[PDB]
Each structure stands twice: as C-alpha cells, then as structure tokens.
Amino acid sequence: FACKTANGTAIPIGGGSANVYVNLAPVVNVGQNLVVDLSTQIFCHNDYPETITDYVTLQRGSAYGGVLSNFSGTVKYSGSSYPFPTTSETPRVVYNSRTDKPWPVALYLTPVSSAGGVAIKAGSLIAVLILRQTNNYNSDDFQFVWNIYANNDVVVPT
C-alpha cells in the first residue's frame, strides 16, 4: 500500500509525510462552503490485491492558520460527513486493486461571523490529515500524514 499526490510526490509502503497544495475558491461567502476536495489530490493503491485487503481511515484531521481562526465545518469521508476538526476516527475504506484510487476526503469549510478580507493566506498551512492504513493479512498499522497548504488567498466578503 502506497500513495501519491497531484504535486508529484509520494509516500511509500510504511507511511510517512507529504505536502499537498490545493487551489481554493478565491471568494467564499458567510453562509456558504469552501470545498477542499482531496480526492483530486491524494491517490493510493494496494500492492498485493490477489491476497491482501487494505483498510484505510481518516484517523485525524486538524485545522491551521486561517481555517482554524476563520472557519468551521465538516469532513466528508466516503459519502458520510463528520465534524472538522475531527473528533473520532472514521470507518474504513477498502483498497483492493493495484490501480490508483482517490482517497475520498473533502473538507466543507464555512466562514465564521467574524471573518472578513483575506481569511486564508496563500502558501499557508490549512490542515493536517492523517490517513491510517491496516490490512487483513498482518499487523501493519501505518500513518500517511498529509500537510495541506493553500495555493492562493481566500477572501470572505463583508
């Protein structure tokens, strides 16, 4: 089991870290959601699907910077939504193919009442998402740590 990103980096068997750079909507209004879709950013596969079934969760999602100070919201993982920043580990998604498969995570972030002007700065860390991979074969339990950065400013109009 290993993963790759839309920025051309990887995390191998056994886990590790990577940076992810996301283009964000430049304007998000109060009462609306900024969508941060990681399924177009992070892709993984199973290295021995003939025998082994891989299981993958979002173990943890944390907010930083302007997201932490100016937004609330949720994370959608494989069709179900949960609070973000996270308060539990999600259910597992099965990876059962050598073919790349997106990691089905998206953040839905809404600006808090006090937000205005530039609410997320270009280049800033917005989130850390921890993917936890196990299987039905051995005792492997690996963390793939995704540091999510904004590629651009996000403004919340007054």
Write out the residues near ligand 3XJ by the rule CB under 6 A.
1, 13, 46-48, 52, 54, 135, 137-138, 140
Q: How far is the CB of 54 from ligand 3XJ (least distance, A)?
A: 5
Q: How far is the CB of 18 from ligand 3XJ (least distance, A)?
A: 16
For tokens 């302007």, the residue is 66
Q: Which is nearer to ligand 3XJ, 71 or 146 (CB)?
A: 146
Q: How far is the CB of 103 from ligand 3XJ (least distance, A)?
A: 14
Q: Which is nearer to ligand 3XJ, 50 or 158 (CB)?
A: 50
144/24 Cα distance (integer angstroms)? 23
Q: Which is nearer to ligand 3XJ, 56 or 125 (CB)?
A: 56
Q: Which is nearer to ligand 3XJ, 11 or 115 (CB)?
A: 11
Q: What share of the chain is helix, strand, coil (3-state, %, to 5)?
A: 5, 50, 40
Report how far apart the first and last C-alpha atoms of the chain are (Å, whole number). Answer: 46
- Is residue 80 packed enough to be buried (19+ CB in 10 Å), middle (13-18) or exposed (0-12)? exposed
